[PDB]
Write an enzyme that holds these catalytic residues in place. Structure first.
Site, short mmCIF file in Angstrom:
data_model
loop_
_atom_site.label_atom_id
_atom_site.label_comp_id
_atom_site.label_asym_id
_atom_site.label_seq_id
_atom_site.Cartn_x
_atom_site.Cartn_y
_atom_site.Cartn_z
N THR A 163 0.79 -1.29 0.04
CA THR A 163 -0.33 -0.34 0.07
C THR A 163 1.16 1.68 -0.09
O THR A 163 0.26 2.22 0.43
CB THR A 163 -1.48 -0.06 1.13
OG1 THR A 163 -0.94 -0.23 2.18
CG2 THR A 163 -1.99 -0.79 0.96
N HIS B 219 6.98 -6.36 8.55
CA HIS B 219 8.00 -5.40 8.44
C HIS B 219 8.73 -6.12 8.76
O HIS B 219 8.89 -5.73 10.33
CB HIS B 219 7.18 -4.28 8.91
CG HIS B 219 6.42 -2.91 7.62
ND1 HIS B 219 6.13 -2.02 8.16
CD2 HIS B 219 6.11 -3.29 6.73
CE1 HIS B 219 4.89 -1.84 7.70
NE2 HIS B 219 5.18 -2.45 6.02
C1 LIG Z 1 -0.57 -5.72 1.87
C2 LIG Z 1 1.00 -5.54 1.74
C3 LIG Z 1 1.10 -3.73 2.36
C4 LIG Z 1 2.39 -2.99 2.46
N1 LIG Z 1 1.96 -1.77 2.83
C5 LIG Z 1 2.58 -1.53 3.02
C6 LIG Z 1 3.72 0.00 2.64
O1 LIG Z 1 2.65 0.78 2.91
N2 LIG Z 1 4.72 0.41 3.50
C7 LIG Z 1 5.92 -0.31 3.18
O2 LIG Z 1 6.92 0.34 3.20
N3 LIG Z 1 5.40 -2.01 2.75
C8 LIG Z 1 4.39 -1.92 3.22
N4 LIG Z 1 4.56 -3.44 2.68
C9 LIG Z 1 5.98 -4.27 2.74
C10 LIG Z 1 6.35 -4.14 1.46
O3 LIG Z 1 5.88 -4.35 0.69
C11 LIG Z 1 7.64 -4.77 1.85
O4 LIG Z 1 8.83 -4.54 2.17
C12 LIG Z 1 8.97 -5.04 0.24
O5 LIG Z 1 8.46 -5.20 -0.65
C13 LIG Z 1 10.08 -5.53 0.41
O6 LIG Z 1 10.68 -5.65 -0.43
P1 LIG Z 1 11.97 -6.38 -0.39
O7 LIG Z 1 12.70 -5.92 -1.80
O8 LIG Z 1 13.48 -6.51 -0.01
O9 LIG Z 1 11.89 -7.91 -0.83
P2 LIG Z 1 10.10 -8.36 -1.27
O10 LIG Z 1 9.55 -7.74 -2.04
O11 LIG Z 1 10.11 -9.38 -0.32
O12 LIG Z 1 10.93 -9.22 -2.60
C14 LIG Z 1 12.01 -10.70 -2.45
C15 LIG Z 1 11.89 -11.48 -3.50
O13 LIG Z 1 12.73 -12.78 -3.75
C16 LIG Z 1 11.91 -13.62 -4.04
N5 LIG Z 1 13.26 -14.81 -4.13
C17 LIG Z 1 12.88 -15.14 -2.21
N6 LIG Z 1 13.94 -15.85 -2.44
C18 LIG Z 1 14.67 -16.38 -3.49
C19 LIG Z 1 15.26 -17.64 -3.71
N7 LIG Z 1 15.96 -18.09 -3.43
N8 LIG Z 1 15.21 -16.81 -5.56
C20 LIG Z 1 14.69 -16.67 -6.24
N9 LIG Z 1 14.09 -15.34 -6.12
C21 LIG Z 1 13.59 -15.24 -4.86
C22 LIG Z 1 10.78 -13.58 -3.24
O14 LIG Z 1 10.07 -14.68 -4.11
C23 LIG Z 1 10.44 -12.02 -3.46
O15 LIG Z 1 9.70 -11.84 -5.06
C24 LIG Z 1 3.45 -3.85 2.13
C25 LIG Z 1 3.58 -5.67 2.28
C26 LIG Z 1 1.90 -5.88 1.91
C27 LIG Z 1 2.13 -7.69 1.24
#
Ligand SMILES: Cc1cc2nc3c(=O)[nH]c(=O)nc-3n(C[C@H](O)[C@H](O)[C@H](O)COP(=O)(O)OP(=O)(O)OC[C@H]3O[C@@H](n4cnc5c(N)ncnc54)[C@H](O)[C@@H]3O)c2cc1C
Length: 494
Positions: free
Chosen positions: A125, A423
């Site tokens: 969001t 988070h």
């Molecule tokens: C409903 C909802 C609302 C949210 N609202 C907010 C908000 O308002 N503000 C906010 O800051 N955060 C919010 N978040 C959280 C936010 O989405 C995350 O903090 C953010 O996406 C994290 O980014 P990331 O790149 O670190 O990891 P992720 O977004 O979790 O991505 C990691 C990716 O790596 C992939 N992966 C994992 N292991 C492997 C592997 N071994 N090999 C290959 N691929 C792999 C996964 O499949 C995934 O697609 C919300 C989440 C949801 C679901």
């Protein structure tokens, strides 16, 4: 399917891994990059938000395909289901089946993950607040600049609801009970949101990768690609082992740089399985304790323009982050809208900064394997006395804020189970030195393995209450710039 070698191999396709792809495409244009995502592509352009999919049936399918092993499981998609405390995931996410709690500990029963191109940012969001006080990582002199760069990559704006009828009213009503004695940065203000645009739509990993990454001939994205190992040769990053989920074949892809952005739980899981086990790995795990509420405003009459999102900033003295929002901008279903006067109902969420403990951790067991064949997760998590006092203050504060905007729809504030915030910080945390309390350097480079970089909420070392994605992207930007400077200034070649 996969190239024999690349300069940079990126694990995951969420906003932090996407930040590496973007800065490397902008600042090191000739460098070959291969991004590997275990989940399928569920949107167009790759990693775009599922809510921008107009068709509801096609939108449900994109959410289901994102839930890995919990695809055929019932989900939480109503405020009644949130309040029922059922151990279910929200759409587009999946829960652990075991190892989420242990006797004498709270654990994280609703700890969730997303498996798709775009990660959780294909479902989020988009609230992008800035950290303040003790949330700010003190050893980064360029923190403000990096946060401004993260704003650029996510397309953050504070003016998307400048045309909404109830946004200024909610803000001024909360300001009357929050602003006293606060400096301007800690006063009630509009939440900075990662929103695109043709109506206002949510931004996903597609905005972070942008046209710079999509038009880079040297970048390639591989979906349905499970990275099972980070390869190390001569003590430095050497590549990735990748299982092509469309065939079962396992390949080895050589690389000079390996960036793991696999979320806060699966990043230490992949490092653990690769034999990269520093003592701080997966330790100092922290969830943001969450309390929710709802309130009806006192007046007459894909993303809608109702009341927007108000931000009640964290302070050291009142260590919680508040958000007051229109029902479609809430990370969790909080209430049904008023039939007669729409937009008159707002949701309230408070998130607590944790009392950081070394024993709060995600551990891994080689004897038990998960749905992807990786070492199963064991979550050791416990709220201390201080955590309970802070969460009690948050329950009082959310009622004060709810009464300030109007008539509360519920009598009591509701605490969500541990893992609800989505988070999770501190599992691959940055630090100044390699003392045994941090996994990586200020440039997100793993102390033990030169060339191996970590990305995500797990990188944050401080005790934070605010939504972490903007900070995690800001840290990814610093890491990606270290890589780009090294590649562009190297005498070596591919
Ligand atoms: C409903 C909802 C609302 C949210 N609202 C907010 C908000 O308002 N503000 C906010 O800051 N955060 C919010 N978040 C959280 C936010 O989405 C995350 O903090 C953010 O996406 C994290 O980014 P990331 O790149 O670190 O990891 P992720 O977004 O979790 O991505 C990691 C990716 O790596 C992939 N992966 C994992 N292991 C492997 C592997 N071994 N090999 C290959 N691929 C792999 C996964 O499949 C995934 O697609 C919300 C989440 C949801 C679901």
């Amino acid at each position: 399917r996969y190239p024999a070698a690349v300069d940079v191999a990126i694990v995951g396709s969420g906003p932090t891994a996407s930040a590496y792809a973007r800065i490397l495409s902008e600042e090191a244009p000739g460098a070959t990059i291969a991004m590997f995502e275990v989940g399928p592509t569920v949107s167009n352009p790759p990693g775009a938000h599922v809510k921008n999919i107009e068709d509801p049936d096609s939108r449900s399918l994109a959410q289901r395909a994102s839930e890995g092993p919990g695809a055929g499981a019932a989900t939480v998609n109503s405020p009644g289901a949130v309040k029922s405390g059922e151990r279910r995931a929200r759409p587009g996410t999946y829960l652990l089946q075991d190892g989420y709690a242990f006797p004498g500990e709270d654990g994280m029963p609703v700890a969730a993950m997303s498996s798709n191109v775009g990660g959780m940012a294909a479902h989020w969001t988009a609230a992008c607040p800035r950290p303040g006080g003790k949330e700010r990582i003190p050893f980064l002199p360029d923190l403000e600049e990096l946060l401004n760069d993260a704003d650029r990559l996510l397309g953050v704006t504070t003016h998307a609801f400048d045309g909404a009828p109830f946004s200024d009213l909610v803000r001024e009503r909360l300001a009357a009970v929050v602003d006293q004695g606060r400096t301007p940065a800690f006063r009630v203000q509009p939440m900075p949101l990662a929103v695109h645009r043709g109506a206002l739509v949510w931004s996903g990993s597609d905005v972070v990768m942008g046209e710079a990454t999509r038009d880079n001939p040297q970048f390639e994205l591989f979906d349905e690609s499970l990275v099972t190992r980070v390869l190390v040769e001569d003590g430095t990053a050497a590549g990735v082992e990748v299982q092509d989920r469309r065939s079962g074949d396992t390949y080895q892809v050589a690389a000079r740089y390996v960036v793991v952005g696999a979320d806060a739980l699966r990043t230490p899981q992949l490092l653990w399985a690769s034999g990269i086990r520093p003592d701080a790995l997966g330790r100092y795990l922290n969830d943001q304790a969450q309390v929710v509420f709802a309130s009806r405003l006192r007046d007459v009459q894909a993303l809608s323009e109702q009341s927007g999102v108000a931000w009640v900033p964290y302070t050291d003295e009142a260590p919680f982050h508040g958000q007051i929002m229109q029902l479609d901008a809430s990370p969790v279903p909080l209430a049904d809208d008023d039939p007669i006067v729409p937009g008159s109902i707002v949701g309230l969420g408070l998130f607590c900064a944790k009392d950081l403990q070394r024993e709060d951790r995600v551990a891994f067991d080689d004897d038990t394997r998960d749905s992807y064949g990786l070492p199963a997760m064991r979550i050791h998590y416990r709220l201390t006395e201080r955590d309970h006092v802070v969460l009690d203050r948050a329950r009082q504060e959310i009622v004060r804020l709810g009464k300030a905007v109007g008539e509360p729809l519920d009598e009591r504030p509701f605490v969500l189970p541990p893992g609800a915030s989505l988070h999770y910080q501190g599992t691959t945390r940055m630090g100044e030195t390699d003392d045994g309390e941090s996994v990586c350097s200020p440039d997100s480079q793993v102390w033990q393995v030169p060339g191996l970089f970590v990305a995500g909420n797990g990188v944050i070392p401080t005790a934070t209450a605010c939504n972490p994605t903007l900070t995690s992207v800001a840290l990814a930007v610093r890491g990606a710039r270290k890589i780009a400077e090294e590649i562009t200034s190297s005498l070596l070649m591919s």
